[PDB]
Amino acid sequence: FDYDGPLMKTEVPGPRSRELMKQLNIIQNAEAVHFFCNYEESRGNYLVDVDGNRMLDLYSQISSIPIGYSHPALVKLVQQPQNVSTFINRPALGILPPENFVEKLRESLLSVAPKGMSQLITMACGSCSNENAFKTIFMWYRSKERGESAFSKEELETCMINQAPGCPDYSILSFMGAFHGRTMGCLATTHSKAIHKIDIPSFDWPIAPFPRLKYPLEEFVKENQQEEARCLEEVEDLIVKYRKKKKTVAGIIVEPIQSEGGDNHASDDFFRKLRDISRKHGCAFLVDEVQTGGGSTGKFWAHEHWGLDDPADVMTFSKKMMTGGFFHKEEFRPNAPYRIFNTWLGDPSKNLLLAEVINIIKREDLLSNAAHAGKVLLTGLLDLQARYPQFISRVRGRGTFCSFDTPDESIRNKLISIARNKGVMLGGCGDKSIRFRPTLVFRDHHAHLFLNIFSDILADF
Amino acid sequence: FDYDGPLMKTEVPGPRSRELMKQLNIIQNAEAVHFFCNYEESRGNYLVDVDGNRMLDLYSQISSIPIGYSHPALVKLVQQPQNVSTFINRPALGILPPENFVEKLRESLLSVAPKGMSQLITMACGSCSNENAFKTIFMWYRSKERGESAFSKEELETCMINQAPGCPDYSILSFMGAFHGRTMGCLATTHSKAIHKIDIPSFDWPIAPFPRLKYPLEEFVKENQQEEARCLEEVEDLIVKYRKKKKTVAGIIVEPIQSEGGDNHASDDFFRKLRDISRKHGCAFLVDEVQTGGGSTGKFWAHEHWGLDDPADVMTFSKKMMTGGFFHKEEFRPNAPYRIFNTWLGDPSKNLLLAEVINIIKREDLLSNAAHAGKVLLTGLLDLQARYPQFISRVRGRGTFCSFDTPDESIRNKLISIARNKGVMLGGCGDKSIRFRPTLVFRDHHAHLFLNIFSDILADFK
Ligand SMILES: *Cc1c(COP(=O)(O)O)cnc(C)c1O
Ligand SMILES: *Cc1c(COP(=O)(O)O)cnc(C)c1O
Ligand code: FES
Structure with a gap:
């Protein structure tokens, strides 16, 4: 052991x-x-x-x-003759799932679903989880704006050639110090270190300050409250500013604790208030638990510390979870197939391992x-x-x-x-x-x- | 069997x-x-x-x-007790590679490297392969423009807030009918079906026509040369136009045979001339073999049919290759670490399978x-x-x-x-x-x- x-x-x-x-x-x-x-x-x-x-x-x-x-429990999985197919026959999970796909999800990811989130799509890494969360958000926002109405002929034409109104000019709001991945959509929301960012084309999306707490916390009670309030105000101001720019903020992405950008923490109150700002402006609230997720904070998902019944609209994960993906509210479900899709959508071998990982986490407390x-x-x-x-x-x-x-x-x-x-x-x-x-x-x-x-x-x- | x-x-x-x-x-x-x-x-x-x-x-x-x-050779690999660790201990490959990392790449991907490309980075899927190939190209292009000079203070400040000059307004040229993935960079280069694209923000990057051949080929030799010529002319015009717009074309991405958009083929000649156009305008030529690669055209990589010693600057792959990644010329090597990076950069267990697959493809012709x-x-x-x-x-x-x-x-x-x-x-x-x-x-x-x-x-x- x-x-x-x-x-x-x-x-x-x-x-x-x-x-x-x-x-x-x-x-x-x-x-x-x-x-x-x-x-x-x-x-x-x-x-x-x-x-x-x-x-x-x-x-x-x-x-x-x-x-x-x-881990000896994971050794045992690989040794079971019945598991050999899972390791050598990788499916295109969006079209040809294995018989046990749903059951093994019940044994694994669905058993740790966040509150309020009935939906689950699997992805192979954290970057494709956040990319597809963004796209899920953009499709939801556009669907709010159209009713009811079908896709217009103009939208259908212009999207194929990278133009509005088919391709809207919406944004995701992100924070200074954030890290959400390095593919080109994730990267625009990443603000970790210059070497991660330099020489790559980006998006003009709003960037808010993340609180910088002062330590020891008990000696900075007012200052830290004030700092968090200032950041919340600047978020709301950015949402207003970008709506006037015709670059409407469709979502807000944040980590519960910023990792790569310097282990920056904020109070649970800050997060609850941020969540409420997001709802108030009709922004989806996207929590990136790729690094905080999987138990190290003492709760399975770090956002559970916040104590909310409605903590977020979308929550991404990967790393400790073996597979990636995102949980989301029912209202964010894509309206049609082949919008959120790729060849593999994770890997059933990783879900096999994760189900045993989750069992060990529960049994060993x-x-x-x-x-x-x-x-x-x-x-x-x-x-x-x-x-x-x-x-x-x-x-x-x-x-x-x-x-x-x-x-x-x-x-x-x-x-x-x-x-x-x-x-x-x-x-x-x-x-x-x-x-x-x-x-x-x-x-x-x-x-x-x-x-x-x-x-x-x-x-x- | x-x-x-x-x-x-x-x-x-x-x-x-x-x-x-x-x-x-x-x-x-x-x-x-x-x-x-x-x-x-x-x-x-x-x-x-x-x-x-x-x-x-x-x-x-x-x-x-x-x-x-x-496949019984793959079943045998999972059965070997020495291979358990590879399935249960997944490394952060960019920082802590396993002892056999290099040797297993020698057995597998490096044994089928395309001409002229000594470099290899691994990735887990076809979309991260293409996004990271785009980035590799953008960094290469800025490197040509800045020479052996340090990043400027202004570049380092502006890149952190999504601004020029640290974030350039460079473009990648792609083709109508293309499919290169669905993450937000890839998806700007994809022009397969409206439902794949609609409602998602994009980039103003140039989009050229891909030739539509007329069949049977023997009856339309001349018309097909003309159609390929017209497409080549429009690629070149677009390159010039986007330079004028200050959105310089840093690379051109193309599939050897367009798949998701409708199995569109073009002559070997067209690809040879396309590659030359790329070189002439200083654009990196990125060949997407995610779906053509791995042998089904009768050569390991489809671009092999073009018969070029210098077929491309960067070539991505995935799907049949079990892992993704991209081969690239030595000149495209990133100049510093942590620019092309992610947690996993593929998975050694997929490399384990792939070596055996490549062994089988060779042994059984x-x-x-x-x-x-x-x-x-x-x-x-x-x-x-x-x-x-x-x-x-x-x-x-x-x-x-x-x-x-x-x-x-x-x-x-x-x-x-x-x-x-x-x-x-x-x-x-x-x-x-x-x-x-x-x-x-x-x-x-x-x-x-x-x-x-x-x-x-x-x-x-009926
Ligand atoms: C590591 C990480 C990601 C990206 O995951 P990859 O699998 O490296 O693409 C995204 N968000 C956060 C917070 C991370 O720490
Ligand atoms: C399938 C495909 C991709 C994307 O591969 P994923 O693993 O689905 O991200 C990219 N390019 C081509 C040509 C493909 O057919
Ligand atoms: S982008 Fe997630 S595995 Fe490739």
């Missing part, structure tokens, strides 16, 4: 990794590569590299590995475990913040979805690189934040292994 | 499929659903439904099943088989066209990538329906064409089985 701690043999990347990185660099830019991995010997919370290093992995493949490496392990982590980070104010500030988190700031990008990267050599894989976000994305099998004792390693690193830095 | 023929028990969809359709329709629009399938009992070219119908499948999951159902079986099919289609000119026209194809037109949409759909109930699954494309996408284990005897069932259908059709 898991090893008893990290065990380092070499610097990371070690010589076998470096050789493999040189080979890969011949066929593509390999500069992002951390190291090469032995996934066969990886177990639980521990990633083993090709040099035999064993690291406690608190990044989990960018928050995408739900119940650790080489891993939601509540993530709240607990996360509190233990956060407490320890607060202790380190108090002892090392020259390096650590703005400690913050929900569940195991935790982060802190360092003084600058150069110290942020150095601390990540030293931790890795000492046996712990950390992620970065923003210009100078370190983030945690532990698998759901991360326990309080793993929080301590990390804290004790990192305490020694800070003492010697 | 295979069953010996179709076996029909019910109309399709049968009662068990209709019940599942009803259940699925509660949670999503299920109006596209053909029927529900028993993939566990499906084998080779035969698909088995939940009503126990066994149909010769000449559509192969929209041309995505490369070596048939339940399946490109040659597609040319041979496809000639059998096309010859029979031409024979049926001669006998039933009132139902069948514009018979055309290359390898098994064949099609024909019917007089109208209702007849096209009736013939597909009838054929299915008689044990043969066909595709439709455009408003009135029928298309073939047989898997690569389609042989001449399957072609004759089809021909012989369809002959009977035609004789009985």
